[PDB]
Each structure stands twice: as C-alpha cells, then as structure tokens.
Design a protein around this ligand. Structure first.
Ligand SMILES: Nc1nc2c(c(=O)[nH]1)N[C@H]1C(S)=C(S)[C@@H](COP(=O)(O)OP(=O)(O)OC[C@H]3O[C@@H](n4cnc5c(=O)[nH]c(N)nc54)[C@H](O)[C@@H]3O)O[C@H]1N2
Ligand SMILES: Nc1nc2c(c(=O)[nH]1)N[C@H]1C(S)=C(S)[C@@H](COP(=O)(O)OP(=O)(O)OC[C@H]3O[C@@H](n4cnc5c(=O)[nH]c(N)nc54)[C@H](O)[C@@H]3O)O[C@H]1N2
Ligand code: SF4
Ligand code: SF4
Ligand code: SF4
Ligand code: SF4
Ligand code: SF4
Ligand code: SF4
Ligand code: SF4
Ligand code: SF4
Ligand code: SF4
Ligand SMILES: [Mo]
Lengths: 438, 131, 296, 79, 321
C-alpha cells in the first residue's frame, strides 16, 4: 500500500513513464499496477516474482547446468574474451545507457565486435539516415501540433500499444484542442491492421512495392503527377492524389515507419525514399519523418556509441585504436553467416529465438555466454548464464525514447540478494581483464 | 502456391513472451499461421489444423488459422518468434536485416502431426535436445 | 478464477476424451479452473445401478462426494446422469438424517465420513450463471464465429427433471441451452418434441436396444425434419446413444441421417479455436466432416 | 445514462478509450470543469469502468469507435 | 389470465414495429430507424409518457445494434398518433389495420405543422443546388437528364429551346417539388437557391447558444447527429493568421438550426448547449391538449452529466429556470 508514482514501463519504444505501482508493505511485492498496457503489466508481474535466478550457471560435461559464483563467471568470461580472436557482443536493446557505456569499455579492452539490435531492426533506417538525413521531431511536437499522421508500414496497436493514446492521435494538445477530430490518419500496409481500423484512410499496398508508392507520391508532390500510370503498387491514382492533396494541405504532418519498410526489399532505400519525400514536403508544409524504434533503450546504444566511437552500430573494434563500421561487413548476422566470429555474448536480447536458425547454428560452434535476468532461448543454449538486474524494476537509470528524448527510469523493487546489475558486471569484467594484463 | 509471406507482431505475442519464452502462453501465441480464407479454401486447409510451411531455408509445422487483420489473397503471416525464424531466409542484401517479411513459401496441409515446442525446435536445430 | 473439482465420470474419459480435454481448456479460457478429482470412480450410474440397489447407489455417490469434501472444493460435472447421481445424493443426504446415518456407518468401514459441506454444479450451469462465467463472457471468449450452422439442442432429462427437485425452471420449453449455442454464433433450431428422452436412460440402452433405438429414432427424425447440421448435448450417455445408435439404427433399421453429435464443450472448443485433432473428433462413429466444412 | 461493457479478455491496455471518452475529457480540457468523474481507467492492463451505476455515459460511441480491436459493446437499451 | 391483448415489439430489419394484437383489430406504431434524428419532440409530446430517448449518438453513428434512437413502451402507448403528427422528420407512422390511418386527424382533433413548402415553377431554373444542399432527401426534382452524367434527356442542344438564330425566351424543362412530409424546414435550399423560388418557414422559433469553452474537444457527436447540419467544427486557422486568437471548439448556424433538440440529447457535456423554443407554427385551430404540448415543448433545456441511476437506459436533461 505504498503507491509509487512516475515509474517507467521497460518494453516498447514508447518508454511510457506515467505508470503507478502499489508496492507491498515490505517493498518487495507489487500488488496493483495502473495506467500501463498489458505487455507492461506482465513485465512488472514477472519482475516482482519470488522464484527467480540468483546465481550464474555453468554447462557441465553431462549437459546439465549447475551454479557457480559471480567471481568464477567473471574469471571465465575474462579469460575467454582475452583468448579469443574476434569475439562478438550482441544485444543492448534492453539495458540502461550506463550498461551500454560499460560494454563499450569492456570491448575496447578486449578488441572484438560490438553490436546491438539495430542491425536486425532499424539499422537499415540508420543507413538511410546516413544517405539523406533524418528530419524528425520529439513526440510532444506531434502531440501538440500534428494535423496529419501517417503510419507507413507500422502497426502501433500491436507494436506500441499506448502510442496512439499518448503521442499521436487521441490526446488533445495545445494547437490541437479538438483532439482526434481534426487529425487525418493514413495507414499504409498490405494487411487491414487494427491501426487501419482506427484510421480514416487506408492504402492497401502490395507487399514489397513501397518504393514505387513513394516514387508516385513524390512525382505528385513535384507537380507533374499526371504522368502516373493508372495504378501504382496496387493503389489507384485517384486515391494517391487524394492522400497527396491532404499531405500538401497539412499544417504540420508526421510520418512513422517500421518493419514494413526496414524488413522488405530494398531495406534502406525504402527508408531513404521516405526521407526524400519528407524533405520534399517541407517545401510547402512541415513534415517530419520518425522511426518506430522498438525496445525502450534501443536508441541508447546509438547515442552512447555515437559519443564514444562515432558509430551507432556495427563496430569494428579490432584495430584497438581506430574503429570501423560497414553494416554489410561488420554486422552480427553477416559475421555469423561467414563464421567470422569466435565468441558470442548474449547481453540484453534473445539471439537464439530471434535470429534465423542458420545463423544460430553457425554461431553455436563457439562458446556462448548469456547475461539475462530470466530464462530464455539464449540462456538455454548458452554455456553459462549470468543473471543481471532488470532496468526500470530492480535498477533505474537513463533510457532513450523513440525520439532520443532521455527518460529517467526509477527503481521499484530491490533485486534479489546477490544479483548485481550489468554496469557493475561489465565493470568487474573489465577490471579482471586489465588484471590479466591485456 | 508461391504464397508470399510476412512475419510480424501481435499483442498476444508480446504478452506471451513476457509471460515467458518457454510457456504454454508463448506456444499458443506464436505457433500460428494467419492466412486468407480464400487461400485456405483453395489450398484445402481445414481451419485450426497443423500445416507444413516450407520455404527454401527451412520448414516448420504450424497451426493454420484465419486472422482478423485481413490478409489479401496471396499473403501469409506468422507472429514473430521461434517458429517464424525456423523458416525465415537469412539473406541480408548487405544490410544486416534478414528477409523478415516477403519471402516465398509453399504450404502443405499436414494434420495428424504434432507441433514442435520452442525448446525442442531450437535445441534440436543446435543438437542439444536432451528430452 | 473460480476453482472446482472436476468429477469426470466414465464415458467422457474412456470414450470421448476430447470432451474432457476441451472442458479443461475452455473452462480455463473463461474464468474457471477445473481440478482433477483424486481417485473418483463411476458415479453409481443412476439407471443401471440405482435399478439394482439404492443403498449402494447412495454409498458410492457419497464416497465420490467425500473425496471432493476432503479436497474442500465444489464439484463440477459435464454429464446429466452424473449430475443426477452426485447432486441428488448430495441433496438427499443433506436433509435425510437416517440415510446420513446409514451411509456413514457403511463408509466407516473405509475410514471415511459424509458431512455435507460442498455443492455440485453442471459445467453448462456454471457457464450460464452470471456470477461465474456468463453468456456474455462466452461470447467474448469465442474467436471463430461458427456462423451459418443449424444446431439442434438435446437437454436430456436428468439435468432439469423433475422440476420439483431441481432449480433450472421450466422443463416444457427451456431456452437457456439455446442461448449458450447462440453465444457461439451457431443458430439453434427448434424441432418437434425437443424435450423427449433419448432412450438410453434407466438401463434401457442395455436391456432392450431396439426399444431404446426406436425412442432415439423418433428424435433423429424430428431433428432431420427441422434441418439440423449437428446435435449439441450436455450428457455423455446421450451422446453415446445419438452416436452409436445412429450406426445401430443404420444396421437394424434402414435409416441414414449422418448427423454429427457433439458435446457443448466440444463446440465451445471449436468456437474458441481448438483443432479437430485436438478435440479427437475422429473418435465419433458419425463423421463430423460436413459440419466442419460448414463452420470452417 | 447507458451501460458500456468491456471484454477484458481481448483488452490490451491501449488507453485510447480513456483518452477519447468526452466525459473523461471534461476535467482537464474544459473551462471551469463541471464534473470531474471518469468512466474508464486502465488498471492492471485492462479498461475498468468506474461508472458502475450507469450515470455518466451519453451513448456517444467515441469510445466504441476508438478501441482499435473492437472490444467495447455499447448497450442502448435500459440495463 | 387473459391473452388476447398481445403486446409485441419486433425489430423487422430497420423498422421497429410496436404492435397490439386483438382477434381482428391491430395497432402498429412503426418507427423507421433510418430517419429518426434523436430529437425528443416525440417524448416531450407523448400524451401518455411512453416514448423515451436512447443512445442517440451511438445509434445515429451506427455503433449500436440492440436499440433504436427511442424506446416506446407499447403497453402504455394509446395509439393516439400525436407522436406521428408532431415529429418534424416523419420517422414515425401509425397503421391501424394495415393502412396508415390517423383517426385524430380524420376527426380534426389536432393541428398539424405548417412546413409551408413550395417552389414557384415560373422562377426555378432546374439548377441542382437545392437537391445538393438538402440535408435530408426531400427534394424530388423531376428533370430529363441531359448529356451531363448520362445519355441526353433530349439533347445538349434541346436543353435550350433553339430554332435551328436566337434562344426563344426560357427553357425550364421538367418540374421540381419538395416532399412536404420530409422537409425539416432547415432552409439550406431557400437561403442558397439562386432565384429565390423556394418558400419554407421554420416550424420552431427561439434561440440556441453554444458555450464553446465547455466542449471537451474530440466529441463531434453534436456535429454527427445534427439533422440540418447547422453545427460545424470551426476550421483551425493557418499559421501567420492566428493573430493570438486560438480557435473555437464548436459553433452553430442559427440560420439552419431548426430547434430540434438532437444536439442537446446527444451532447455528453454539462451545459454546452442551451435550447429554448418560443413558437411552433401550425395549421388547424388548437386544443387544450395542444396548449399542454406547447407548454411541454417550450421549457428551456440543456445537457447534464451524472443523471439519476434509477432511470438508467434513457436520457434526462436539465431544467433551466
Ligand atoms: N520472424 C521474425 N523474427 C524477428 C523480427 C521480425 O520482424 N520477424 N524482428 C527482429 C528484431 S526487430 C529484433 S528487436 C528482435 C527483437 O527481439 P529481442 O531483441 O531479442 O527482444 P526480447 O526477446 O524481448 O529480449 C528481452 C530479453 O532481455 C532481458 N532483459 C530485460 N531487461 C534487461 C536488462 O536490463 N539487462 C539485461 N542484460 N537483460 C534484460 C529480458 O529479460 C529478455 O531476456 O526480433 C527480431 N526477430
Ligand atoms: N506485443 C509486441 N510489441 C512489440 C514487439 C513484439 O515483438 N511483440 N517488437 C517491438 C520491437 S522489437 C519492434 S522493432 C517494434 C516494431 O514494430 P512495427 O515497426 O510497428 O512493425 P510490425 O508490428 O511488425 O508491423 C509492421 C506492419 O507493416 C506491414 N508490412 C509488411 N510488409 C509490408 C510492406 O511491404 N509494405 C508496407 N507498407 N507494410 C508492410 C506489416 O503487415 C505490419 O502491418 O515493435 C515493438 N513492439
Ligand atoms: S506502450 Fe510500451 S512502454 Fe508504454 S506501457 Fe505499453 S509496453 Fe510499456
Ligand atoms: S459512450 Fe461516450 S460518454 Fe459513454 S463511455 Fe463511451 S465515450 Fe464516454
Ligand atoms: S480502447 Fe479497447 S483495447 Fe484499449 S483499453 Fe479500451 S477497451 Fe481495452
Ligand atoms: S420526434 Fe424525433 S426522435 Fe421522435 S420519432 Fe420523430 S425524429 Fe425520431
Ligand atoms: S401514439 Fe401517442 S401515446 Fe403512443 S407513443 Fe405516440 S404520442 Fe405517445
Ligand atoms: S435551387 Fe431554386 S432554382 Fe434551383 S432547382 Fe431548386 S428551386 Fe429551382
Ligand atoms: S428546407 Fe431543408 S430539408 Fe426542407 S427541402 Fe429545403 S433543404 Fe431540404
Ligand atoms: S443545431 Fe439546431 S438542428 Fe442541429 S441538432 Fe442543434 S437544435 Fe437540432
Ligand atoms: S457540444 Fe456536446 S457533442 Fe458537441 S463537442 Fe461538446 S460535448 Fe461533444
Ligand atoms: Mo526491433
């Protein structure tokens, strides 16, 4: 019955911080959680569990898995990181920004490849940002000004549940006092998703033809739109002209995109034609692209490694004094394919589940270490499983929202007696490696 | 028959993973095909029956249902997870983003065959399936 | 999540296991938790065993009741005959003192006493009650519409009759079970003499199979005339009669109906998305495939 | 004064029924707020209707039209 | 008991049919739910207090299925037909045996509304504006359809009486009228007619006021349910034109408001809307019943939040002093 305000929900890009927890009398049981979506409710319900991992656990010859002390696990990982020739550390989607700084230091000492879930998720988007730029905005800007909203290839209803009710559509802002009723929502994707149910338009496009769709829109905008064919990408020219007229007349627009663009043919060229469209619309209106980042602090590795090495993802830290970045050559999946690794470290992700199974097969040839709070597929095919605190429930810190706005997450439960957090763990690994004098 | 395919999200799927990747909720949420009613009739797939989704980079036995989110004739959909990534092709096009949406696949109605659990799928792909 | 001991008599586990499997799954999907009963047996089947000896009927039903009494839980049932045995012996021994005494000194030979502390419910009764899962909750849980199917309900006799001994209301033309089928999306149809016995009760199924089959055939004729595509039922006796007896009617007489017979729990599973293989519809004598083509 | 029913089984906690209700929007979005009572609040991930005695709803349909995966049934007949 | 006063209430498609059986005599109060507009001028007028008003916004938007705009207690209704005479948009009909039959008018016991419609065919020019602006489908224009949108009614060149040169005077091909039982006296067609050839007079007179500062924004239920589309959401100004005045949230056009009351019945706010009618315009003399009905219609009203629970399932407004 000790109600705690302003907590952070640590799952989706929304980084919602309007969460209220009613912690038990002893400060270690969560009773009721208000204002959060279900996916979040379950995160907190799992964090407040009574039967949770407390010590590392090693793979014995028999194939079972027995516990070891933290110092022994740190010794194991340090010795292996030094003995290896090009270790790969992957993850960082779900960690505080101190967890993504400590890891950068550890792999600076080691000399391996450091990488995050950007490669497999919105890294194709960054590659377009490198090409064309990122005309964007914070989310309060679309809350307080947006007149048109476009969800191109995204599905907020199931990806980011309270995105619509917090930032985009339903809130009544300052210059949008009328709320939804003066917002025009356009949703583009081949399915008739729940976002399309809520929407007012829908451009059911053939899966994979978004490049042709964007080119049609941009010819319309550039002015001689009469040269369009009868239909484009399955969309009909009159509907194209309708949506384009709405976009032109928008007082302040905003485009959101997701897997519909970053996981189909022409991974980054879809995103950069979208960005070109936004830059073209800002000739006569105000339009701001914006990427639907997935995990809470998945924009955290981007900024932290931007300030540390200058490169958001796919870091080639093997020269030990100059880093390199080329996603086609230094990314986790391509290196796993070309068996270019020597050790895989699972930190803040589920590589076993969410990688292609050929890549997982290629990777498991080498040692495999997992730093997770709870059991998952990586912790089931790893060699040792080091527990760690959960961001936002057992430990606080900074996280980075969809739009690179830092939210400060709070602590609601003390972690089980013995369990440390990743910044302490990565720092101890780095200290032990320097002790081993490499 | 060529039957283009995508792999995407669902709230029940997110809920399931945060219950736990090894839970009955996760099994129920992810082992799912959400295809079109016209395609189900034309192929010969009984609603709520196992089916063999076999692409060039694998194979998986997955329950076949119909989804509210109306897939147009010629589209498939698995909620992302163990089962979908058993069949996702690894081609990246030198970008690091595998072909997670938009790969061809053939669908074969194969009832009377069980579904493979998440642990069984992954630990057997690696060669660790003790149980 | 309400919790009930799941009695699970003889025919559902040993002839139609899909009925019990769907019972557990669908009850869990709605807010009900069905717990196994530890060492329960045949509820002394009211016809074939009550006709022989009422005292041993009382003793065995009381033993089944005191198992769940020790479990400290309320019985949940899926059979009208099991409901008769369990619920009615519970009700009789909650009020008749000399019968309590007699049953107790019979049960004292196995270190076991009846005190009358629990209640007995039919699963469909729970699905209909508003405190427990209601019709609206069933509609919410339904995910496959099952639309465009004509479905005939068979209430049975031991759930609702005699109305001076039960609490379900009118026995002449009840509509409550028709509301549960309408919740699933299937339209329930009305047929002549819908409240007729199926003919399997009282041991007639065994004593005079031709007599029992004639009683069943009267129903099957009325149902076909109405135009049903399946027959829902709340009793494994009645399901066995309507299922086997169609085959025995096809052989002893020359009548062909091919009307699938499904328990309401099996239809609820189909509505909630369970697979036909997971429901074991291959264990029925009468093929359900036309009905599956219609509703799928 | 109508009655709204929320299917808890498919409610995702999206909170677009709370934000869009025009009786909820009375407190913070009106000059000199008249009534500060609220129909819905998302407690434990599902929308709970605090309007137990059916006194504040006006059958507007803004909340039924708002929920992305239809889950709110509006009853226009006396409860 | 006794059975033959069989009271039934069936929803046959889109018509809610309320019936009273006898052996040979029936009584059918039939409400056409596609034309009802959610005003309460049928509940205020009911002599026997049977008609109540339901989920106006939801039903008028299509989000409600198990109800109509209005609920009539057919056990209390007396089948007088006062509701049918006093409904501005005829969405209620009385059928005694099988025919639309109003005994109270047959005996002249009740006045009727003087919508007073007319279109001087010596001034109308077959324009298309009056059919286009009509909020309800009440302009029956009977004109041959020329090459515009169809094959020629006569010919493009015979749309003008030409001697083949000069036009001979005037053309006026066809005939245009106003279905007098459907017009609601909004006056969109009179105010916008090019040749001032339409004569309609509003049935009600009074004033309606909108306190824009009390609308909670995204609630365009009033806009959605207004029959005469008098209400609008005032368009937000562009930048470099706002001039420090932000915007209004809602407003009305008193030229087109017909003082119906659907806006008041639909608004979920507290007192955004103030409705007061001052004079109904009738033909037919009068009655003590009609004076009572005038007194009932002419009481000022406004919205209300948190009405009483005992009447849950209907609407209750605020009595303004
Ligand atoms: N078929 C298909 N597969 C896909 C995709 C697709 O589109 N289709 N998309 C791919 C993409 S977009 C990515 S993001 C992946 C996403 O997939 P992942 O990035 O793997 O996301 P999760 O599986 O939820 O990882 C959560 C794990 O991190 C743990 N954790 C939580 N907090 C912390 C912390 O603070 N510190 C540490 N050390 N651990 C913590 C959690 O307990 C959990 O074990 O899916 C990918 N796989
Ligand atoms: N419950 C739950 N929530 C999540 C996640 C989860 O796994 N479970 N993952 C989180 C993370 S890691 C991610 S990155 C985010 C991302 O989630 P989102 O970026 O919002 O994308 P998706 O949810 O996968 O749905 C993408 C939509 O694009 C459609 N689409 C597919 N192909 C095409 C195409 O070719 N063209 C167009 N125009 N559309 C196409 C798809 O049908 C789908 O409707 O969600 C996060 N939220
Ligand atoms: S939208 Fe995402 S961050 Fe917000 S409450 Fe839901 S899961 Fe948490
Ligand atoms: S119908 Fe309108 S007033 Fe009633 S709960 Fe829904 S949004 Fe609120
Ligand atoms: S809008 Fe729908 S899904 Fe979202 S909280 Fe309300 S009822 Fe639940
Ligand atoms: S008076 Fe109004 S509410 Fe009553 S029937 Fe006529 S249009 Fe409908
Ligand atoms: S016919 Fe008369 S009594 Fe009946 S509802 Fe209409 S006005 Fe009221
Ligand atoms: S608006 Fe006037 S001139 Fe035009 S068609 Fe109508 S009545 Fe005739
Ligand atoms: S007054 Fe209004 S409703 Fe009547 S004919 Fe003119 S435009 Fe139509
Ligand atoms: S503006 Fe006039 S016509 Fe429109 S709803 Fe209000 S009172 Fe009725
Ligand atoms: S006047 Fe009523 S219907 Fe119109 S915006 Fe205000 S509350 Fe909503
Ligand atoms: Mo992601």
């Amino acid at each position: 019955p000790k109600v705690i305000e302003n907590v952070g929900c640590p799952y989706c890009g929304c980084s919602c911080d309007d969460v209220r927890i009613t912690v038990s009398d002893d400060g270690k049981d969560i009773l009721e959680v208000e204002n959060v979506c279900a996916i979040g409710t379950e995160i907190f319900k799992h964090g407040c569990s009574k039967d949770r991992i407390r010590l590392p656990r090693m793979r014995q010859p028999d194939g079972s898995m027995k516990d070891i002390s933290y110092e022994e696990a740190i010794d194991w990982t340090a010795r292996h990181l030094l003995k290896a020739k090009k270790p790969l550390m992957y993850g960082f989607g779900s960690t505080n920004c101190e967890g993504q700084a400590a890891a950068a230091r550890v792999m600076e000492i080691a000399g391996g490849m450091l990488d995050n879930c950007a490669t497999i998720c919105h890294g194709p988007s960054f590659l377009a940002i490198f090409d064309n730029g990122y005309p964007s905005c914070t989310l309060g800007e679309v809350k307080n000004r947006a007149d048109v909203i476009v969800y191109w290839g995204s599905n907020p209803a199931h990806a980011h549940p309270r995105h619509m009710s917090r930032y985009s559509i339903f809130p009544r802002g300052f210059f949008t006092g009328k709320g939804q009723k003066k917002r025009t929502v356009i949703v583009i994707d081949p399915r008739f998703t729940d976002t399309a149910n809520v929407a007012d338009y829908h451009l059911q496009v053939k899966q994979g033809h978004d490049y042709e769709l964007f080119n049609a829109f941009r010819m319309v905008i550039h002015g001689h739109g009469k040269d369009l064919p009868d239909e484009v990408a399955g969309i009909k020219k009159e509907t194209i002209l309708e949506v384009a007229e709405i976009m032109k007349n928008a007082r302040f627009g905003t485009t959101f995109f997701g897997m519909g663009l970053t996981h189909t043919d022409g991974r980054n060229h879809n995103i950069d034609i979208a960005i070109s469209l936004t830059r073209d619309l800002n000739k006569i209106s105000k339009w701001t692209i914006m990427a639907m980042r997935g995990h809470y602090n998945i924009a955290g590795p981007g900024v932290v490694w931007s300030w540390t090495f200058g490169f958001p993802y796919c870091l080639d830290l093997t020269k030990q004094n100059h880093a390199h970045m080329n996603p086609g050559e230094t990314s986790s999946v391509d290196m796993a394919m070309r068996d270019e690794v020597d050790m895989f470290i699972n930190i803040g992700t589920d590589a076993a589940a969410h990688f292609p199974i050929p890549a997982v097969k290629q990777l498991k040839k080498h040692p495999w270490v997992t730093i997770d709070p709870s059991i998952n597929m990586a912790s089931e095919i790893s060699d040792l499983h080091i527990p760690v605190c959960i961001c936002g429930v057992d430990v606080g810190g900074i996280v980075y929202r969809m739009d690179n706005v830092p939210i400060q997450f709070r602590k609601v439960i003390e972690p089980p007696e013995g369990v440390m957090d990743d910044e302490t763990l990565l720092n101890k690994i780095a200290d032990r490696m320097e002790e081993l004098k490499a | 028959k060529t039957l283009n395919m995508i792999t995407q999200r669902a709230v029940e799927e997110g809920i399931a993973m945060e219950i736990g990747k090894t839970s009955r909720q996760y099994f129920d949420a992810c082992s799912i095909i959400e295809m079109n009613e016209q395609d189900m009739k034309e192929l010969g797939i009984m609603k709520n029956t196992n089916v063999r989704v076999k692409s060039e980079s694998g194979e998986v036995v997955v329950k076949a249902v119909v989804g509210r989110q109306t897939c147009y004739p010629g589209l498939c959909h698995i909620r992302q997870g163990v089962w979908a990534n058993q069949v996702v092709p690894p081609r990246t096009q030198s970008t690091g983003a595998p072909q997670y949406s938009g790969f061809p696949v053939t669908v074969e109605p194969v009832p009377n065959e069980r579904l493979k659990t998440a642990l069984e799928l992954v630990q057997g792909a690696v060669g660790m399936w003790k149980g | 999540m309400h919790e009930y001991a799941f009695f699970l008599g003889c025919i559902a586990p040993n002839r139609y296991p899909g009925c019990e499997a769907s019972a557990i799954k669908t009850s869990e999907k709605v807010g009900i938790k069905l717990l196994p009963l530890k060492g329960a047996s045949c509820c002394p089947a009211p016809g074939a065993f009550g006709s022989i000896d009422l005292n041993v009927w009382y003793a065995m039903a009381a033993r089944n009741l005191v198992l769940a009494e020790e479990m400290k839980k309320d019985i949940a049932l899926i059979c009208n005959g099991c409901y008769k045995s369990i619920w009615e012996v519970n009700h009789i021994l909650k009020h008749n003192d000399e019968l309590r005494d007699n049953v107790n000194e019979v049960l004292a030979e196995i270190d076991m006493q009846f005190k009358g502390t629990i209640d007995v419910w039919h699963l469909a009764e729970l699905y209909y009650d508003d405190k427990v899962c209601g019709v609206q909750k069933i509609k919410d849980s339904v995910t496959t519409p099952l639309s465009g199917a004509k479905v005939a309900a068979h209430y049975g006799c031991h759930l609702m009759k005699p109305k001076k001994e039960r609490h379900f209301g009118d026995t002449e033309n009840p509509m409550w079970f028709e509301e549960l089928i309408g919740a699933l999306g299937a339209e329930p149809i009305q047929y002549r003499n819908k409240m007729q016995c199926c003919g399997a009760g009282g041991g007639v199924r065994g004593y005079d199979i031709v007599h029992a089959l004639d009683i069943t055939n009267e129903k099957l004729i009325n149902i076909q005339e109405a135009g049903a595509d399946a027959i829902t039922e709340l009793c494994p006796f009645c399901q066995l009669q309507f299922d086997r007896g169609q085959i025995e009617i096809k052989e002893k007489f020359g009548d062909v109906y091919n009307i699938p017979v499904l328990h309401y729990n099996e239809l609820l599973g189909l509505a909630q998305g369970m697979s036909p293989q997971d429901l074991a519809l291959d264990l029925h004598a009468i093929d359900c495939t036309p009905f599956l083509q219609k509703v799928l | 004064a109508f009655a709204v029913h929320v299917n808890m089984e498919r409610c995702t906690g999206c909170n677009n029924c709370v934000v869009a209700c025009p009786v909820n929007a009375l407190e913070l979005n009106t000059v000199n707020p008249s009534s500060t009572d609220k129909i819905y609040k998302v407690i434990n991930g599902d929308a709970v209707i605090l309007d137990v005695k059916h006194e504040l709803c006006a059958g507007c349909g803004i909340c039924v039209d708002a929920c992305p995966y239809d889950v709110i049934q509006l009853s226009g007949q006396p409860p | 008991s006794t059975l033959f006063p069989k009271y039934s209430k069936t929803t046959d498609g889109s018509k809610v049919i309320m019936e009273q059986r006898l052996l040979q005599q029936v009584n059918n109060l039939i409400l056409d739910n596609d034309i009802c507009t959610g005003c309460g001028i049928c509940s205020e007028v009911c002599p026997e207090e049977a008609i109540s008003v339901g989920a106006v916004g939801g039903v008028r938007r299509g989000l409600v299925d198990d109800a109509a705009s209005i609920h009539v207690d057919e056990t209390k209704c007396s089948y007088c037909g006062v509701c049918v005479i006093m409904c501005p948009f005829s969405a209620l009909a009385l059928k005694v045996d099988g025919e639309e039959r109003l005994p109270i008018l047959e005996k002249e016991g009740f006045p009727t509304y003087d919508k007073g419609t007319a279109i001087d065919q010596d001034k109308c020019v077959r324009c298309n504006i009056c059919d286009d602006v009509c909020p309800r489908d009440a302009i029956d224009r009977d004109v041959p359809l020329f090459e515009g949108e169809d094959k020629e009614g006569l010919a493009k060149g015979q749309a003008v009486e030409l001697k083949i040169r000069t036009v001979v005077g005037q053309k006026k091909l066809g005939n245009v009228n106003i279905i007098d039982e459907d017009c609601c006296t909004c006056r969109w067609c009179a105010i916008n007619c090019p040749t001032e050839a339409i004569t309609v007079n509003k049935i009600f007179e009074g004033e309606i006021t909108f306190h824009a500062e009390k609308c909670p924004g995204g609630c365009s239920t009033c806009v959605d349910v207004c029959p005469a589309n008098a209400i609008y959401l005032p368009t937000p100004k562009p930048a470099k034109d706002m001039k420090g005045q932000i915007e209004a949230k809602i407003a009305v056009n008193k030229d087109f408001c017909i003082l119906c009351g659907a806006c008041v019945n639909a608004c979920p706010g507290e007192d955004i809307i103030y409705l007061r009618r001052d004079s109904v315009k009738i033909k037919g003399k009068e009655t003590d019943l009609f004076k009572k009905i005038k007194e009932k219609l002419f009481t000022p009203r406004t919205s209300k939040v948190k009405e009483q629970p005992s009447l849950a399932g209907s609407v209750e407004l605020k009595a303004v002093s």
